[PDB]
Symmetry: D4
Subunit: 199 residues, 8 copies
């Protein structure tokens, strides 16, 4: 089941959960040039909500309420980007987050391939652009967009098990705590700079 | 005035201050191979303390008490390294820090030269290896080691003025808050990895 | 229908249109060394004309009349090259042009693949060397040469829709206006120089 | 004589001239992050005006009137940057410009050093950062800022002689005509992209 | 036949042989961060022993007795790594070794592909990650781990024939004699340094 | 028909021809380290001779007589290597040569792929390591070795047609005349140096 | 003594010599764009002739007679360039040449610095751009231009001694024999291609 | 005192010492092309012997006796090269060696500059090409050649102190033991290959 909406959620039903999987689609990698076009959400129950964002849209009160609720962990893959584009679009930076890309880099030390496809293949044996600004999204587009959020909860559970096993929970927690500010630094103009590097 | 000590401070006098400038010298850039040899401290009063650390020394209770005191800000230049070597040597990671290198990268956006010599030259018009494991340090070594801490307070004051002026105080605060964990990540084996990069 | 000609068009029939798709084939990427061998034209009606150019040929009055007519937009893919080789061969630089490669770089910001095959695949679901100096071209050569012009009109229509949608029409217009001079700069000896770069 | 102003010119006297030398200073190379701090102007009479721009200043009617006057050529060195920062700050893009950096690249083909210092050294035997946001600029800062505009007229005269001599006037004219749109492309987010390159 | 053990060999039966094939699996390429998880052994009789090593395990007396026995040649592929991780884990550096990777580099001079898969393909026509820290290894994991040791004896025989044929036996012997110290240098912190290079 | 010989030709029959296709196989790319193992010859009649060269063999009088005969053009693909290894092994440098790799670089200007497989594919629609020091070559080895010489005559004919067509015959002739000295320069120690480059 | 001429030599006096030192100056490194502006000649008697070449000049009969005379060796430093520009300007390619840059690369194997300044410094202890198209050359320009030819004879003598000493005379002779064709290849469009390289 | 000899030592007087400093000069970095021209020796008493080696010289019995004597340690700086050229010239590979470059890389971990000049500057405050094949060496050449051996004993003493201090004596000993075979590998054709690297 994939529910497609225009502009905002109708309500926050099905989203009283403790953690929500979140992803975005845009016109590109540069938030100042490339607008947010689609937002995907999942409660982890095997269904997803796909929300089409209009050009110039500045507000999405129910969605933004969800994004701002500190009692709900937002799960991303490479949240550095999604946090940046979400904050740029709606003016709210989430501050309770989990990133599967950071978790992979902290746990899957036996590989250099940390993409979502490879992670899903290794951990779950699950097999995972286009004009996202189109007025009407195709069925293939909607199914692809939903596929990016359907599995993030299971990955979070496995990565939390691995982080506990290798005793890296506080490292991951500190990285996730800093991640929203890393995204803010990207938005402010340091996107090409490792702020902690010697040069 | 440069006070040279063996092993530890005799007491914590002159160090009831709100912020202390800290620097280290080692046998190299790799904390697991290159031992800490000298630690420099200054209260900002134009004097410095230079503490020679012995091979295999595991404890320095007065120094470590200072390093652990959360009411005293530790000022570094490129604290990413000093925090790592200090934590590796004495087992205590400072958690209240200020880094002039991060501050320069956040404020001196008109240059790509962020070294201490260039910073001192631009901001203060002040003009700033060897076998640091020698049993007896030379006078030139002692004076050079002291010169690296004598000016960090004045730099911190100027950088705080610039951070306030450009409205980047919360960004800098979050970077400084994460810096000890960046150093821990370096110590654990991710020293060559930008943990937030896409690849 | 692919009409193959020797030297020049017999007349300008079927070419009273408002825009003509144009492409070339040569012996290589260097106009001073690698001669123009074939020119392809299409009115957009699903047919193409393929004109074999002889070695040392200096004139093609009907073709050059078409190329010089300011009331007819010449459509290219990467016109920077075709304009250069056409001007070098016949002495006339077109000044009313549309380039699908520039348009892709101005609109398909969600990808780094701007080749004609990828563009045709994404926008139209259409699936797209050899001795072009041969006295007799093979049937496969003729069909391949025609395939490069059969779809440029449909691409121009879609790219114009996207340029209007993202409000970049005046940017594209200025780029297309400068493109003939970019080709002239290439012909004069600056082909390896970004004339606008700092270094 | 160097006249220092706050905010704007008092009037447009001394600036009825046919061409004006223009330069800027900023907090860095990124117009979205690094604000315009100082603007320098010269009529070519050996004097200069140095205008300090306040943080958040949105208007400078006399200056902007000068920048918008199509009967006055604006002379820059590497105008790609200055045009971008000026348009970003005051909302007006000059469209009658001359760039000594483009002219050097089109005429000084016997060297790969096109900086202003090298140009002034070769063509005139004339011998040519800091916190430009300071409330009070130092005398050294003011003299340095003025030195960047005092010689652009003489360079323009020599470069025009060379462009006429080598018969490249129409090439240069077309490059200068496109330069404001190159700056606009930079402002819109393509600053790292050669829009005319194959890849 | 693949025998899977927990912690150590039950005894040293089947291992009175003159040469033993040895391989390891770990959590990654960095012995200080990535623990040894599995050790594979073979006597060359077409069977293998797969020994799961527990987290924090410091001793394996029967295995370590085998590793320390100077009358038994230990065969590795790229022993530089395995020797390092074995010495780091159990405190014993083997000093009688044969490395098929060094042998390939000394004999297969007609190729630049020296991986085990390519070697097995060329010399034997034999056709050759995952969470190796899992409490229970899968059947696929066990079979893959065994496949890495089943063929090293046959490769050693062929490489010894080639080394004799091309008269490079003393070169190979000296390289193998130095290899344990190369591994020690890696363990001590010079893993990224060619100690014999000019720079 | 592939005739396999030990040491030398039995006689020079079938080799009164005006041009002979020649190729070699070795233990690698470095003539001082990697010995010549096999020589292949063809008269162009669709048959080939494959001559196994013994370790330490210094003479092959019939073969060397053929290689030295100035009335017979030796055809190579990338003769720079074959000439070097032949001269190093038998002490005779051929001085009447044709190289299909140079010819391709002088004629196939529309591609950057100049390997023998690609050349045979484009020009002829013909579809084209191992231990070459083995005492007995396999049937697959013999057939592969023969396949490298069976087509060089047809390529030479086509390349000569193209060189005549594009009026580059004297350029190619001078390149072929210099090629033996290029090979000698390689043998003397300048194999990594473009002797004509500025740096 | 430096004799400055317009267009051509008045006669060929002082130039009955067996070898002449030759150099050129141009507007740049690209013969198709950057015209020949000055030619320098010396008989080796410590004097030089400096001939200003006019824009568009196609003939210089006395100079070209000298350049074409096969009984007179033309000495260059990096003749690859000078031969190309001379042949492009006057239509005559010298075929009896000596190049000090090739000679240095064949003899000064103990250094990687083969520029004329370094050669003159090492071999002779002699201590060695601008608008060369100026109607009137300055005295400094004339003296600099002459300094580039005053020493080539002495260098040729020393390099010939070294080539004889190291037994590389026939190698150098073959390189010099090919050099005019290397220059022709540059003129034809292969200036960026090592025609003898594998790739 | 610098004693200059032709061909060989007259006798082995002054060389009953326990360690001898050794250096060479050649025509370049490639032993197969660039012959040994000069050998320098010192007993450590502040004097040196400089032995000119003739072209084609195959024997130097007194020198080679010294080089072969296992009771005398040969001290080099970057002995990898000197050992190679000595073995290539005289057929004897020393097997008791000390290398100051390896020692620096094992002890001076606080710098990346390991050249002899920098080492002498740091450790001793001592301040440290040409045609070495000249029949008569100049006084400057002789003094420079001697300066390269006059200080190696003092460096060896200091490096041995540092190796003892940091407990790396057995590492250094194993590296020095392998160094002659590293030089042999260079001579055999692996000079560009790190034989222990993964790729």
């Amino acid at each position: 089941e994939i529910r497609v909406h225009q502009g905002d959620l109708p309500n926050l039903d099905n989203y009283r959960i403790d953690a929500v999987a979140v992803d975005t689609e845009t016109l590109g990698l540069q938030p100042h040039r490339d607008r947010l076009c689609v937002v995907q959400l999942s409660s982890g129950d095997g269904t997803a909500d796909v929300i089409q964002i209009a050009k110039g849209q500045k507000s999405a009160p129910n969605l933004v309420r969800l994004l701002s609720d500190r009692d709900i962990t937002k799960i991303f893959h490479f949240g550095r980007f999604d946090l940046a584009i979400l904050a740029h679009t709606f003016g709210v930076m989430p501050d309770v987050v989990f990133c599967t890309k950071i978790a992979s880099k902290l746990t899957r030390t036996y590989t250099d391939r940390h993409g979502l496809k490879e992670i899903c293949g290794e951990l779950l044996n699950v097999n995972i652009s286009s004009d996202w600004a189109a007025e009407t999204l195709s069925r293939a587009q909607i199914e692809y967009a939903a596929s990016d959020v359907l599995y993030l909860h299971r990955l979070k559970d496995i990565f939390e098990e691995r982080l506990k096993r290798e005793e890296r929970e506080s490292v991951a927690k500190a990285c996730f705590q800093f991640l929203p500010m890393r995204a803010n630094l990207d938005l402010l103009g340091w996107s090409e700079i490792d702020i902690f590097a010697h040069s």
